[PDB]
Design a protein around this nucleic acid. Structure first.
Length: 109
RNA sequence: UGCUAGGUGACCCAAUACGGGCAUCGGGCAAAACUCGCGUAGGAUUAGCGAGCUGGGUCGCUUUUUUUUUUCAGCGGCCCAUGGCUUAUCCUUAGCCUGUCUUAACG
């Protein structure tokens, strides 16, 4: 609901720090819980439907079939960078992004 | 592989009588050569490595030789898995360690 609010409001700045605090503590919680109780980890990111976000390294891929996804660069504003990360780790938000993109492109047409 | 001692000689030299060289065998211990575990000058005004930059298969990788058992590497050619590192590369200083001097010691 905050990412819906935050394509709605762009120039908000105070609890966007709090938005970062939720994203970072959620990352801490998954990366702890995978080490701690793996069945609960898999259970939750199947029920919510989330990918793996755990950590010259590999992000715990399988034995074979080593499909990969790594992004490293070779001055920004806020929401122009905080939007595609939160789109990137979460597939439901990517689905909402492509759905509202098709919605606006066929609503303007 | 290299030394020293042995034992052999259808060989050569020496011998008022006998030992040396020369070939081969094998006992003793030995070097050599390779591999990896770590250590190691600073520089971001060196940030990507202009590269096979790492790995797997295939050969080529110039010898059989005592009983159940025995023989490295990208080093080159070919495919191929697309990865390997990130003080990685690049620069400039510099042989390295024990040493010697000092400090009470650490340095």
């Amino acid at each position: 609901e905050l990412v819906k609010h935050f394509d709605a409001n762009r120039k908000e700045l105070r609890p966007m720090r709090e938005l970062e605090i939720m994203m970072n503590q959620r990352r801490r919680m998954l990366t702890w819980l995978r080490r701690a109780d793996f069945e609960s980890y898999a259970y939750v990111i199947s029920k919510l439907g989330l990918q793996d976000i755990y950590t010259x390294x590999x992000x715990x891929x399988x034995x074979x079939x080593x499909x990969x996804x790594x992004x490293x660069x070779x001055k920004t504003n806020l929401w122009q960078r905080l939007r595609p990360q939160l789109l990137a780790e979460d597939p439901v938000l990517a689905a909402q992004a492509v759905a509202t993109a098709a919605a606006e492109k066929q609503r303007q047409t």
